Amino acid sequence: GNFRFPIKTKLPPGFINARILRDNFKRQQFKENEILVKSLKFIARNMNLPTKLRLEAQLKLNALPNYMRSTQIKNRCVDSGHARFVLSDFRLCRYQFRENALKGNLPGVKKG
Amino acid sequence: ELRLLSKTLQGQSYRDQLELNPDVSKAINNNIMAVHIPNNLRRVATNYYKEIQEPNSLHRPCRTKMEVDAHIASIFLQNYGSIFQSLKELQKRVGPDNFKPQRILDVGYGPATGIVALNDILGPNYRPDLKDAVILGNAEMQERAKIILSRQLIMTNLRSSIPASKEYDLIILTHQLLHDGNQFPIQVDENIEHYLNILAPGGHIVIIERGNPMGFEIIARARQITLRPENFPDEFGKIPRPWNYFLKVIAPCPHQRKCPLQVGNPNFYTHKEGKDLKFCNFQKSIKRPKFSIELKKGKLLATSWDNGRDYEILNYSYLIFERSHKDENTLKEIKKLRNENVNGKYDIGSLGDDTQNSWPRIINDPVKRKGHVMMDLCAPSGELEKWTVSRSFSKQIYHDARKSKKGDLWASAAKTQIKGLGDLNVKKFQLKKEERQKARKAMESYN
RNA sequence: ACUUAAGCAGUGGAGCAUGUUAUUUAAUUCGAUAAUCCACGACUAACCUUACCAUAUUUUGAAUAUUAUAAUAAUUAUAAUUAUUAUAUUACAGGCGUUACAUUGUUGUCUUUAGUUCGUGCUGCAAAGUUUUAGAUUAAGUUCAUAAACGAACAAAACUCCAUAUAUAUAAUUUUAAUUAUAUAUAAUUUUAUAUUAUUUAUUAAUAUAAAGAAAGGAAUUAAGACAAAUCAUAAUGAUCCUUAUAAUAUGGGUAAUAGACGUGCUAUAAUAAAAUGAUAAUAAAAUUAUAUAAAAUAUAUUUAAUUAUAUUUAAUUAAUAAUAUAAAACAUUUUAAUUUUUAAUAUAUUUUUUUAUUAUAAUAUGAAUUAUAAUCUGAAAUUCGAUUAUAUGAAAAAAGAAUUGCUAGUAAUACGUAAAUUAGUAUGUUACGGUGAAUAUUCUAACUGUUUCGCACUAAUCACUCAUCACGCGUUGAAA
Numbered sequence A: 001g002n003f004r005f006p007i008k009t010k011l012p013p014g015f016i017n018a019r020i021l022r023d024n025f026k027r028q029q030f031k032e033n034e035i036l037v038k039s040l041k042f043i044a045r046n047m048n049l050p051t052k053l054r055l056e057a058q059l060k061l062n063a064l065p066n067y068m069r070s071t072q073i074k075n076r077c078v079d080s081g082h083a084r085f086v087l088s089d090f091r092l093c094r095y096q097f098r099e100n101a102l103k104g105n106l107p108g109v110k111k112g
Numbered sequence B: 001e002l003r004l005l006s007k008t009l010q011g012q013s014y015r016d017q018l019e020l021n022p023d024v025s026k027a028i029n030n031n032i033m034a035v036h037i038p039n040n041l042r043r044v045a046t047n048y049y050k051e052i053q054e055p056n057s058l059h060r061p062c063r064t065k066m067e068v069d070a071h072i073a074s075i076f077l078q079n080y081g082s083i084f085q086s087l088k089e090l091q092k093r094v095g096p097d098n099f100k101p102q103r104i105l106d107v108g109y110g111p112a113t114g115i116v117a118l119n120d121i122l123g124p125n126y127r128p129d130l131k132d133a134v135i136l137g138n139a140e141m142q143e144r145a146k147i148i149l150s151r152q153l154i155m156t157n158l159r160s161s162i163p164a165s166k167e168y169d170l171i172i173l174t175h176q177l178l179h180d181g182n183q184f185p186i187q188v189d190e191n192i193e194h195y196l197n198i199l200a201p202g203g204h205i206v207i208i209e210r211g212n213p214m215g216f217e218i219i220a221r222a223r224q225i226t227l228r229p230e231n232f233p234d235e236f237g238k239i240p241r242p243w244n245y246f247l248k249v250i251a252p253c254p255h256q257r258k259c260p261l262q263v264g265n266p267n268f269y270t271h272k273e274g275k276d277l278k279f280c281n282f283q284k285s286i287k288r289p290k291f292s293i294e295l296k297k298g299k300l301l302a303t304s305w306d307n308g309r310d311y312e313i314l315n316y317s318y319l320i321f322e323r324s325h326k327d328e329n330t331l332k333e334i335k336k337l338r339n340e341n342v343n344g345k346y347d348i349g350s351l352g353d354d355t356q357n358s359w360p361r362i363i364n365d366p367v368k369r370k371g372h373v374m375m376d377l378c379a380p381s382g383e384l385e386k387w388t389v390s391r392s393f394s395k396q397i398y399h400d401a402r403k404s405k406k407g408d409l410w411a412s413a414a415k416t417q418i419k420g421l422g423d424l425n426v427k428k429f430q431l432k433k434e435e436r437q438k439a440r441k442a443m444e445s446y447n
Numbered sequence C: 001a002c003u004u005a006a007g008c009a010g011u012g013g014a015g016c017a018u019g020u021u022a023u024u025u026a027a028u029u030c031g032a033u034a035a036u037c038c039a040c041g042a043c044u045a046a047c048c049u050u051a052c053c054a055u056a057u058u059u060u061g062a063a064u065a066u067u068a069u070a071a072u073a074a075u076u077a078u079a080a081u082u083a084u085u086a087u088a089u090u091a092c093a094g095g096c097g098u099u100a101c102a103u104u105g106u107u108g109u110c111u112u113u114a115g116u117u118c119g120u121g122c123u124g125c126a127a128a129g130u131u132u133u134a135g136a137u138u139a140a141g142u143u144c145a146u147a148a149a150c151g152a153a154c155a156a157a158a159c160u161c162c163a164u165a166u167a168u169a170u171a172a173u174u175u176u177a178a179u180u181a182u183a184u185a186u187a188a189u190u191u192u193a194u195a196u197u198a199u200u201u202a203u204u205a206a207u208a209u210a211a212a213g214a215a216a217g218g219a220a221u222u223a224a225g226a227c228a229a230a231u232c233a234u235a236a237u238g239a240u241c242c243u244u245a246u247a248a249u250a251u252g253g254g255u256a257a258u259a260g261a262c263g264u265g266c267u268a269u270a271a272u273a274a275a276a277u278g279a280u281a282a283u284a285a286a287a288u289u290a291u292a293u294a295a296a297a298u299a300u301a302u303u304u305a306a307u308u309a310u311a312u313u314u315a316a317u318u319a320a321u322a323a324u325a326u327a328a329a330a331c332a333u334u335u336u337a338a339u340u341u342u343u344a345a346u347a348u349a350u351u352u353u354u355u356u357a358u359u360a361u362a363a364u365a366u367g368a369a370u371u372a373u374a375a376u377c378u379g380a381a382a383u384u385c386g387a388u389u390a391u392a393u394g395a396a397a398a399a400a401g402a403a404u405u406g407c408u409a410g411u412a413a414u415a416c417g418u419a420a421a422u423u424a425g426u427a428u429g430u431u432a433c434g435g436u437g438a439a440u441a442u443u444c445u446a447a448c449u450g451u452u453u454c455g456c457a458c459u460a461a462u463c464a465c466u467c468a469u470c471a472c473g474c475g476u477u478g479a480a481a
């Protein structure tokens, strides 16, 4: 069990903790399986199609693992890994945002 | 399928929240305050509170009648809670069978308070021979004390001073071992020497104090003077100790060596170097009766002097001794057990006798993390220990540890057992001439 | 002088939502505990998040380095070295383990910030002091003045920045809002003149009256002490503990349990107030749209249409362009239980949408919790446990009070709406935005702070210091049958 996840995935270049690794792995596998998930969902949600095809597509959707689910991706702070108060404009939690903003790291951002 | 051990249940201290008897509380709310407008009762209660905020202050006898009413309104609840918990501890640690005392003395500043607590504890069928109750502060406290005791079922004898021709087998002292902020080391000695003379063989003395560093220091000194730990070095375990007279610590201490937390002078807690000091107190929760809830209202008692609860957390320090019996058997038994019983150096991690009398004492809230529980114990080795219980070591013991609380006795072994650092800031508790000479020498050296 | 007190405007006994606590639980992840009170973070907990529980599973794991192997490319003269990638190797990695794990730091709160040092000068033998001064004035260090003191540096102020008013520039006035946008500059910390009051006598101040002005608000910006804080999620370092498990992954469960108690919010308890309707569309601002946004139309609920909610289809716009989005209160008409204060039949009238006469004629048409049925939405998934719609259901809530919130202000209040963050989805929370737009006056009390008077045997500075007691010895001297 060399790698904690089923599929080898490159590490993100910056701060790391177990939760960042879990989120990054789910993001990579969501990217890899997005077209499959959308195709299966389309087959399941097309009422022109026979009911057996739709049921088969829904079954294959329920059979997919958790790391392909879009709803399981959570925006974390890229600097601290925290998952609360993350501003999507910088991918930082509010404290890291304030720290970086006062250091001049965030382009254009000023004290109000 | 996994449940608490009978041993662990035996080690646990009384866990349920406290509540006054409904009859007692109804009587108090109906009589002792319904004739009083709330504002002035609050004023006097605020006066009393402000003069006990001072660090390492002491309780004070009720001078006036309105102070009697205020004390019953505000200070009676936590005094009752402390005595109830101490008496439950005593009853459990001697077994409910051996705890059937007949000669009862209660001394405190409030109404007969250990007496009403004892009444609640031993039920409505307990009718012993003598139920003396000395009330100090004022004569009028005795009348409302009768009011309280009527609603429990009188044979409680309300006095103003100790009868001086009889021994007792259950004595309760509440805030009685000290009266001065100064004078502190020796008044404890005098006061305990007073009440030990009237402790019958086989009797119990239950001392209760404030639960602040000064209170802990009072209990620590009272423990030291009775025990003389320095006079019996290398003597582990609990054997009755001389003071034809002998007495042993029941609770909360699981040994009779030097208390690990004692720093002699309370003032060290006030400094900026003894702010990390720790003291031995214990906590309980007690439901607020209506009269308490209706008292602490407004800018006097509800604001910050610079959500509410339905209960109060009371802090208290306490101590319990038993006096031995008198017999040729018991005397020679104590001599032989002191002579030829090398119980052995109780090392760190030991449980002592592995009975109630030597089980460690949990004295801090344990830290419970996934798969491991860290306890700060006053161990039967005389020392201050830190024990970690893990799931991988044992599922059952970890299950029991995950429910332990401060004030319990921990009856089981643990994997990691190390020296606790709660005593770190304890051991660390002409230059003018050097400055003068150095000044002159350097001044003549510049040249 | 924070605080109190007064006055004004509210809110406040119920239901629900959301927290905390208690109890419960496999778990209900974490948070307080020296006696007034107080365990209380959420810019989104279905899975994820997650920290917790159950059961399985992983074992150098996410790192760096060493040593081997197995390939793969480059170079030597065919083996070799050089690197890259895998596998193993062990130092280890890893830790939402410990604050009863200590340091700094940082953060919060509070006190003080016209004051602290330095340099000269001057006084005293000197330690020291630097003297008017315990100055005047203001709501305020605000504005001034003064002295054997005078400066400097910092601090404060000025300054600066918003906003407001104006000038120039720019825009081929179809990216239109030129009533705009955003660059630069100007302006004020307003000024003048009388009269009355006081005055340290005017060249002062206040009030009033005139005159010129658009001129009326706000923010930031330094240190020094004290205490608190380990969701210190404001870090780092160190110590200590776990290393087949206190690290790691998956499935499901929990954080949503319900006796209580309390905080906060939302909806209410009807007539100075609720409802409905108002299409050449009364009247906004500020935001958002490439991890979107959704127009108009059509279809169904559904009833001519409209309204409302979904579905179908995605027009335009990645934006001063198009969309979210015709703002809503306001205002007008109509209606409204309690209420025989009404409706209806007949007459009646110069009140006709109406009048008159005679006849009959404590919970509602308030409130919207709870529950049932059927749909819908997002999502792979809505069981624990989400949101919406329709048809039903239709609870508590009426009187008085503790208690508390905020207080000249474009503030409070508002059955006024609007937007954004955090989302795939859910706001009664938070932060923004504009519309309408008040009332009241402050006797009182005051911790605490700053000056001061006086005393001082204290100087590590009252938790100070001296004095005296009690014991233990070792001396010295005196009287002595």
Ligand code: SF4
Pocket: B219, B220, B252, B253, B254, B258, B259, B260, B261, B262, B280, B361, B363, B378
């Ligand atoms: S239990 Fe232990 S710490 Fe507490 S007073 Fe006794 S000896 Fe001291």
Ligand SMILES: [Mg+2]
Pocket: A071, A073, A074, C423
């Ligand atoms: Mg999400």
Ligand SMILES: [Mg+2]
Pocket: none
């Ligand atoms: Mg979950």
Ligand SMILES: [Mg+2]
Pocket: none
């Ligand atoms: Mg899970």
Ligand SMILES: [Mg+2]
Pocket: none
């Ligand atoms: Mg480490």
Ligand SMILES: [Mg+2]
Pocket: C095
């Ligand atoms: Mg962990």
Ligand SMILES: [Mg+2]
Pocket: none
């Ligand atoms: Mg209705």
